[PDB]
């Protein structure tokens, strides 16, 4: 027999973790990971509060009005698992742990001798602007620590599509008037 | 008496909505709102699957090992409600519905005669680059439809802090080599 109290404690823990995750500021990197991890744990609890509940109906024998609902839940959870697998594949592609932490649709990526820069980015654009110097590379507020120079070619990675951007112009302090800040402009390649 | 089946159906609905929300692409505006709305509904269900469960313990009389946990849940939910109120206050401040849709920490905002542009932004930076022309204004991949010119002063809004950025240089196609694309550079004001 399956006691009902396990379902109650599981849903209580799920509520705790969901509420904790919903109020975490996503500003520093360690904040990004921890919150993400919490979601992962919460996801597991969700499975619990689903699967155990389903087992309860197995004890009840009233699965007829809920078999379709539980099948839909499992299908959506499988889709989420496939999404996580795609995220890991993207991480392997760009060789960085940033795509796990951020939820951006696209990632501007480029590899160097010592480091591989990965930066979140929302949507594909004709031009991309990279800002260097406060030194660090910032795009749309997302920041990566400076370790080397930038290559002439950068790649926008997604789940399925990849785009190439080539450096066209570089703006210095004198041409812009902003001290200790340099701008790099990349344009998409059509071929 | 409170039947247990309501808790089961509530947790099933909560699982359905959580799983549906976790697999929605955040690319188009209507996708952003709907997903957000789903979360809202899911949040309500969470309260249900908490509050009803608490009431069950009221029938049980075993609130002693869970009163602190439920108090923590309610405290976190109150914090989330205050966060939603702050989001609405930010919406009223910038006069746009974008901050409801996006989860960005900061928002670049500026008002015109006919429209008030609001664009998500991750963190405060010394310089901000605005890209115009494919016409639209894009920052970090986030896009707003063109309706008028840009003002010399823009404001980065947050929950509590506001920053000012002034236009310093404007880069045209000739100076950059990128056709039909214009760049605007804004620098922070210290005073």
Partners of residue A169 in chain B, C-beta under 8 Å: 171, 175-178
Look at residues A149, A154, A105, A104 and name the one whose alpha carbon lies nearest to residue A129: A154
Look at residues A176, A184, A173, A178 and name the one whose alpha carbon lies nearest to residue A146: A184
Task: Identify each DSSP E strand in chain B by its residue range.
Answer: 106-111, 116-121, 127-132, 136-139, 142-145, 153-157, 162-171, 182-188
**Spatial distance between the Cα atoms of B88 and A102, rounded to a whole number of angstroms:** 24
DSSP at B137: E
Burial degree of A59 (CB within 10 A; 0-12, 13-18, 19+):
exposed
How close does chain A come to B139, measured CA to CA in Å?
6
Burial degree of A104 (CB within 10 A; 0-12, 13-18, 19+):
buried
Of the candidates B14, B69, B178, the beta carbon closest to that of A127 is on B178
Distances (CA, A) of B42 to A18, A100, B15: 11, 24, 8
CA dihedral B90, B91, B94, B96 (to 10 degrees): 160
Look at residues B119, B117, B157, B154 and name the one whose alpha carbon lies nearest to residue B140: B119
Q: DSSP labels for A61-109?
A: T--TTTHHHHHHHHHHHHHHHHHHHHHHHHHHHHTSSHHHH---SEEEE
How close does chain A come to B19, measured CA to CA in Å?
6
**Spatial distance between the Cα atoms of A167 and A25, rounded to a whole number of angstroms:** 34
- What tokens appear for A136 in the block? 């660090």
Nearest CA in chain B to A21: B76
CA dihedral B9, B14, B19, B23 (to 10 degrees): 140
Give chain A's largest Cα–Cα span: 77
Q: What phi and psi values does residue B94 have, to the nearest 5 degrees?
A: -85, -10
Pairing of strands A182-188, A162-171: antiparallel
User: Contact, A73 vs B15, CB < 8 A?
Assistant: yes
Of the candidates A106, A126, A177, the beta carbon closest to that of B169 is on A177
User: Contact, A126 vs A188, CB < 8 A?
Assistant: yes
Chain A interface mutation, best of B125, B134, B179, B190, highest count of A Cβ atoms under 10 Å: B125
B187 forms bridges with which residues in the sheet?
Answer: B127, B166
**Spatial distance between the Cα atoms of A132 and A137, rounded to a whole number of angstroms:** 5
* Contacting B residues, span 143-182, partner chain A, CB-CB under 8 Å: 143, 168-169, 171, 175-178, 181
Of the candidates A15, A72, A177, the beta carbon closest to that of B50 is on A15
B10 forms bridges with which residues in the sheet?
Answer: none
Nearest CA in chain A to B185: A176
* Contacting B residues, span 10-39, partner chain A, CB-CB under 8 Å: 11-12, 14-16, 18-20, 22-23, 25-27
**Spatial distance between the Cα atoms of A72 and A171, rounded to a whole number of angstroms:** 53
How close does chain B come to A105, measured CA to CA in Å?
8
Sequence-ordered alpha helix ranges (H) in B61-105: 67-94, 98-101
**Spatial distance between the Cα atoms of A49 and A54, rounded to a whole number of angstroms:** 9
User: Contact, B44 vs B52, CB < 8 A?
Assistant: no
Q: Residue B94: left if φ>0, alpha if ψ -120 to 50, beta else—which one?
A: alpha
Backbone Cα Rg of chain A: 23
Partner-chain contact A185 B185, CB within 8 Å: no
Dihedral of alpha carbons A143, A139, A146, A108, sign: positive
- What tokens appear for A63 in the block? 């699965």
* Contacting B residues, span 36-55, partner chain A, CB-CB under 8 Å: 43, 46, 49-50, 53
How close does chain A come to B90, measured CA to CA in Å?
16
Give the strand order in the sheet containing B182-188: B116-121, B106-111, B153-157, B162-171, B182-188, B127-132, B136-139, B142-145
Partners of residue B137 in chain A, C-beta under 8 Å: none
Backbone Cα Rg of chain B: 23
Give the strand order in the sheet containing A142-145: A116-121, A106-111, A153-157, A162-171, A182-188, A127-132, A136-139, A142-145
Partner-chain contact B141 A121, CB within 8 Å: yes
Sequence-ordered alpha helix ranges (H) in A113-172: none
User: Contact, A17 vs A41, CB < 8 A?
Assistant: yes
Look at residues A132, A131, A130, A189 and name the one whose alpha carbon lies nearest to residue A165: A189
CA dihedral A92, A94, A97, A98 (to 10 degrees): -150
Partner-chain contact A178 B185, CB within 8 Å: yes
Task: Identify each DSSP E strand in chain A by its residue range.
Answer: 106-111, 116-121, 127-132, 136-139, 142-145, 153-157, 162-171, 182-188
Q: How many angstroms is the resolution?
A: 3.4
Partner-chain contact B122 A131, CB within 8 Å: no
């Amino acid at each position: 027999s399956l006691p009902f109290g396990w379902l109650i404690v599981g849903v209580a823990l799920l509520a705790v973790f969901q509420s904790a995750s919903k109020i975490i500021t996503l500003k520093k990197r360690w904040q990004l990971a921890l919150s993400k991890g919490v979601h992962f744990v919460c996801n597991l609890l969700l499975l619990f509060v689903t699967v155990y509940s389903h087992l309860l109906l197995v004890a009840a024998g009233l699965e007829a009005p809920f078999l379709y609902l539980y099948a839909l839940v499992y299908f959506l959870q499988s889709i989420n698992f496939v999404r996580i697998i795609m995220r890991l594949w993207l991480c392997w592609k760009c060789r960085s742990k940033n795509p796990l932490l951020y939820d951006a649709n696209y990632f501007l990526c480029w590899h160097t001798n010592c480091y591989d820069y990965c930066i979140p980015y929302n949507s594909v654009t004709s031009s991309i602007v990279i800002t260097s110097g406060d030194h660090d590379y910032q795009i749309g507020g997302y920041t990566e620590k400076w370790e080397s120079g930038v290559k002439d070619c950068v790649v926008l990675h997604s789940y399925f599509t990849s785009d190439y951007y080539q450096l066209y112009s570089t703006q210095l302090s004198t041409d812009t008037g902003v001290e200790h800040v340099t701008f790099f402009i990349y344009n998409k390649i059509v071929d």
